[PDB]
Design a binder for this molecule. Structure first.
Ligand SMILES: CCOCCOc1ccc(-c2cn(C[C@@H]3NC[C@@H](O)[C@H]3O)nn2)cc1
Ligand SMILES: CCOCCOc1ccc(-c2cn(C[C@@H]3NC[C@@H](O)[C@H]3O)nn2)cc1
Ligand SMILES: CCOCCOc1ccc(-c2cn(C[C@@H]3NC[C@@H](O)[C@H]3O)nn2)cc1
Ligand SMILES: CCOCCOc1ccc(-c2cn(C[C@@H]3NC[C@@H](O)[C@H]3O)nn2)cc1
Lengths: 448, 448, 448, 448
């Protein structure tokens, strides 16, 4: 009914992460990450699921890349298992680790797919976590040597780099709420991890510039959007806190060399402060070429004193929800793209966007109409913002494959391709074929 | 997950219209209305459907009222067939017309249901339409004699009155776009009808005050909400035009004694002007106790020169739609309730809200979960605004019964009770039972 | 997509026959007809079905008439059981016979339904068949006394009369092919019966005029249409023979005081001649106000010497067929209406038209979409001919009720209302509700 | 029930077109056709479908030919992608283009299948369309060099040639109604294209004779049949206009050296004339060995002034329709075969006949009974005309494969073999196996 045409050089993609798809968790000298530890602890992951085999992408990468070529996709966002390159994050490199990523990347380049390399997608080596992990400044040095090895090793092979994925998850979800590895629950150690992340980021960007590594580099925050239930100041502040901790808390330092004062005041009142040393802010402010934003959902939030450390209560507006229980409201993606212009018209990529739709293989196909419906609403909002002159450069569907969805295990399916975890059979879903017509035409026809 | 508690004295209701449910179109001296004429003209109504029998509520009113009592509802909004009281609108009254409404209203009052009486729900007698209908200032005097008869006839029996329902439909849909009776397509005659409506309204309110008739009186505009695709001025103006013609065009005169200048300028440029005579604005500005608003849907609109007389193009955002193809975005009801505060914190009733869900009787019941889902999102927005201190006094579900949906005939089901047009059997839908617990508890819990 | 508007005064109806629906075959002094005898003989009727109970319309006439009123139909075509009025056709009248038809007819007139009375619908009393039946000139006088009694008995109560139904069936199907009662197979006795029919017709029309009985009278031939497979003369002649024996053989005498010479020559060569006495042609030529035509199907026929007594072989064109195996080609009705203009622009009624669709009651209703599809194509052809200025005055659906379909018994359903022969339950089919809107609107819209 | 025996040497076939099945739209130096351009323009083709891969017959031709051999078919009608031989239609030939058609044709001849080569099946090179395409007389020269190359290249390999397929579509559908590539809407440029087509045809036939190329050559018009709703002259003229523009407009010049005067007068009154130069009619009148006729549907048409440029309104006779909404009335094929005898008893081939039936693979088979039913009715009409002594030499089912149905995309299935456009899997439908018994026996038994 309406036609939405995309810019000529718009980067269509699909996204995965090492621990979620790779498997082969003990092969070719791989050391245990914090997620190996976490998935092997009873009660941490639904149904006791772990990434031991996952989608076995370590061996099946040839098949996955063939399905990407047939998709006619332009970029493929993957993540490097740190413990595959530095099993202890010690400085003793694993050449078998590198060899795998060279095979993967070399195939992508031969098939005219541009690699989009996330260095850190939560697989911190357990060796570093034994010594305090991201709460220890020693990890900052460890990450930079990892970042450096990859920059040196895959120079000219990779033109698009992200240091970290979803810092809010790595810091606050992993160390405040205890939902993700390593599953702590302390305001102060989350803030510590958060700050050390940014220093490790800055220094890795610095080395990239010093090495004159090929391409462009950035960070990929998960981005929350909240809207106030009331015209009340207290409800507006609750939304501000929710929005700012996901985006502003990591982006204001990188772009404006400071933390959001109102959140520093909020945390200080809970007896937490940012462990800021001399030259830390200078390092963090090291200019970056683009950001990724991961958008999934938006919410209506009311002030509530008993509603967690941000005193921001999500309200059930009665909206329809994905199989993981997230409401679908595409206009949040439009709102957050406009909100992020406070940092200027930066080059933004949608590095993750997708829906949890648990439809399985019936008569040889997956009839995931609800995933097509989700994607349709969200790609309108991407066009809508490009048309407002915002520099949205690309869109990457989460995910290429049904994968290990962290603490939900294999129970929540985000993939555009169905994966059977008994047989490792790939079945492209209806969404795969619908998307193949949205990337190859480079326009979208909204109709149902 | 979230609980929404309503004010103590909040008015729960259901809504119908005479032509849509009554039937008995030739019985007890009823004269033909413009809708009888329109429904009897081939190509005007889908499948050649007409209101000749409809839900046969003329004879089955006892059954419908029993189903309302079991619903535990507090108000009932109905409309009077003008041509049942004045078959020619000539001043010769029909006692059989009045007797029916006395039987209906007397039952409602005996069952502790408060009647909410809409005088005009598009039933214009054909006798007056032969003379030019609402385009002829003659109808204004005709309507006031009708209004007066009802005021005097049902004084103390009825405490809630609306002069007109959806003026935008009566004027612009009926006389500009030609979709509704009497199906003309002339900018000038629509504006004429629109103006004459307001004069007839003012004078009827005046007589109500002069008669010291029991209760309170108002008008019930259908209310559009549009949001711009772009931050562009042209796109914002297109939305303003769309929003203002539905609400502002009838409400600005009643509340601020003028027409929206920007729409007068817009129309003037198409060679149309308002036939405003001396003291017309004074009549129209006669104070009213409250308004009804009919809300259904919301839209995203772009400026487009070839997109009808308002040059406002609705965009398909890929959102899910009701069976009549309207998208559901409850937050429009919240936005428009805030927008209407430009006339101050007036007493507002939701006189119509509902979804077209065509589920039929299967294993003895209707499984209209999508209607419950719709109602749930919208009743959150009603709570949301009451909580912002807005004087939203009540909510009336459109509709009590599957009825004659005008130009769609019986093909679109809005009812909360299923009606088999073959047998005139009433089957309360799942929505009826869901709604019965919301109005009886006087709170709502969101889930699904 | 296309709208077909009918003339203001167009007569909408349904049609039944006494033996097919009445039942009560021994009640109130009814004498056995030839069909009672035939249905009681093994191998004559499929499954040994008979009209002993049928639809029990003798007792259930009140119910059937109510369903007609709700249909909004204008005419009702029924037939009189001769042996109910004259059990022996001997001149001793049965007052109980008449009383039933007075009850039926009086209800029809009270409900504003115009009776359309067929005197002979194959009910010949067995007493007359013992004496040679229609092959004996004795029956001619017997029929006229019957015709007369009814004319005098129901004067002013009935305004539309047919002497005979489907003469071709009564004569050739019943006495040449042996398919229908009394099931003979002799060219000569068929031609005899055929001739005696016409004399009985002429004399009955004469008495109607002499009695100055109220209304108009005619005959209702079943009408075949055949089209040649080849442009060959022999194939064209085969069609002519097939067409002429159904229509021309009874209509040429009534309208042009002769038999089709080419068929007399054809039969004469098989040693058959018409037993025409002095003044017979004069009697037969008694002017009539209108005809009925019964149309169902059309065919493509080849000359074939071994293809029955008419040497006309029907060819299977692979067309789709009704459940009784007749192909649907509506354009035959248009062709035959034009062909019959050889007798001038006479007043024609479609006294029978319908399809055999054996859909049963499923989830409280009959989904006989193929019957609606059939009726739709045929009512276009009725409009098409009226638009060519042909005097087609009415249309009567065969049948109101699933009935006793002669030699097929209850296995072929032609009814527009379902009848459960187990329980005598009436269930209006989808066709009933579809037809109800065509006759009430008095226009038709083609779709599906 | 009836047996229809075909002549001994009757040519059974199946038909495809290059753009509809080939795919490989950029491979081995292929230049863009006007259909590549048209399919890549948003809003031109349903669902944004294009022939980029189609059935991938460029690579899968071996499989398709094996399925033809198992069918026991005698002829295979295919079309040559002009832009595969002359990517710019410039005169620089592509040897890789020729090599493909030599591989295809050589396989057909080895398998005893007779190639039936359509030179032009709408794939005009975009290079020529940039310069005005068929509206430019330069294209005439371009086509003749193409025609010539193929004649020289495949002499003795191919014995059956068609210059153009469906001229009415190429001219009027493509350039008057704008439905097909290149999607113009101008009476005059359609007539231009139409005339230039005929000159290009004549000159190509001339070269064929001069080259003494092996076999016989013709043209394949799509053939409409219309029948008047009324006996009125104006309704008869409307049909004449509809019939003549499809057939007579291209056939009267080839066979009688003139255009239908009544259509020249009709067009002249709309300010259009045929751009006829000296020797044009002489060229067009170059004798031809046979025609193809493409028959699908016939219609009932009424005169209507507002019903397009021919003022001929199709009426919905309520007949059943194929999934693409065309009514099935086989007797049109019989009527048009008789009508075409105005050019004498020419050798006619049914080069296209088929139904759109969208049945998909269920339990390993396609249950396309409606396609068998369609084919059955139409093959009776082919026998019927052969039996009238008409020189109908052959029948080619449209289509071998589900293909790219132009502006309907992949949504409308005409194939006798099912194709999955995700996996390129061929599944012979029930129609394939039914037809295999109609070609191999060389008789047909009409029964259902
Ligand atoms: C008690 C309530 O519970 C609180 C848990 O709160 C969350 C919030 C958000 C998430 C979340 C998961 N994803 C998908 C992944 N994105 C990064 C990529 O690697 C995907 O695999 N995004 N957000 C999970 C849990
Ligand atoms: C060709 C497309 O052009 C635009 C169609 O134009 C409209 C606009 C609006 C409506 C419409 C119908 N309703 C529901 C009733 N409200 C009053 C009450 O009695 C309900 O029965 N609201 N709006 C229909 C048609
Ligand atoms: C062995 C095959 O040999 C040929 C069969 O021969 C026929 C011919 C025609 C019919 C036939 C049945 N009807 C319907 C009734 N019309 C009158 C009305 O009362 C309906 O109940 N019409 N024609 C049956 C059998
Ligand atoms: C607004 C109403 O719309 C007007 C569109 O009018 C038509 C008419 C006719 C056709 C048509 C398509 N075919 C099948 C192909 N035959 C040639 C072969 O290559 C097949 O692929 N035949 N006729 C399409 C569209």
């Amino acid at each position: 009914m309406t036609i939405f045409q995309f810019p000529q050089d718009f980067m269509w993609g699909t996204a995965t992460a090492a621990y979620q798809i790779e498997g082969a968790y003990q092969e070719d000298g791989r050391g245990l990450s914090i997620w190996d530890t976490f998935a092997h602890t009873p009660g941490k992951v639904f149904n006791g699921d772990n990434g031991n085999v996952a989608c076995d992408s370590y061996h099946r990468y040839e098949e996955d890349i063939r399905l990407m070529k047939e998709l006619g996709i332009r970029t493929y966002r993957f993540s490097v298992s740190w413990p595959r390159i530095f099993p202890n994050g010690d400085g003793e490199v694993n050449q078998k680790g590198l060899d795998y990523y060279h095979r993967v990347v070399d195939l992508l380049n031969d098939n005219g797919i541009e690699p989009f390399c996330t260095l850190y997608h939560w697989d911190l080596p357990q060796a570093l976590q034994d010594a305090g992990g991201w709460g220890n400044r020693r990890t900052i040095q460890a990450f930079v040597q990892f970042a450096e090895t990859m920059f040196r090793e895959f120079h000219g092979k990779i033109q698009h780099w992200l240091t970290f994925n979803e810092p809010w998850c790595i810091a606050f979800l992993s160390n405040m709420l205890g939902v993700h590895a390593p599953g702590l629950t302390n305001l102060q150690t989350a803030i510590d991890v958060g700050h050390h992340l940014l220093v490790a980021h800055g220094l890795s960007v610095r080395r990239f510039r010093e090495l004159g590594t090929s391409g462009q580099i950035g960070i990929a925050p998960n981005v929350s959007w909240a809207v106030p239930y009331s015209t009340s100041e207290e409800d507006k502040a609750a939304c501000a806190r929710t929005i700012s901790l996901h985006s502003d808390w990591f982006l204001q330092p990188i772009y404006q060399g400071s933390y959001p004062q109102f959140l520093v005041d909020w945390f200080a009142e809970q007896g937490a402060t940012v462990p800021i040393q001399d030259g830390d802010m200078d390092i963090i402010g090291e200019p970056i070429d683009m950001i990724g934003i991961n958008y999934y959902s938006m919410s209506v939030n009311r002030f509530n004193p008993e509603a967690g450390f941000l005193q921001s209560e999500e309200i059930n507006m009665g909206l329809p929800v994905t199989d993981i229980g997230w409401p679908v409201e595409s206009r949040g993606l439009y709102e957050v793209l406009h909100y992020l212009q406070k940092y200027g018209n930066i080059d933004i990529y949608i590095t993750e966007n997708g829906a949890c739709i648990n439809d399985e293989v019936v008569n040889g196909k997956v009839q995931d109409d609800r995933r097509i419906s989700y994607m349709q609403q969200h790609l309108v909002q991407v066009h809508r913002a490009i048309h407002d002159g915002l520099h949205v450069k690309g869109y990457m569907a989460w995910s290429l494959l049904d994968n290990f969805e962290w603490a939900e295990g294999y129970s929540m399916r985000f993939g555009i391709i169905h994966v059977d975890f008994r047989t490792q059979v790939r079945t492209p879903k209806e969404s795969y074929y619908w998307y193949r017509k949205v990337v190859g035409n480079n326009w979208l026809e909204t109709r149902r």
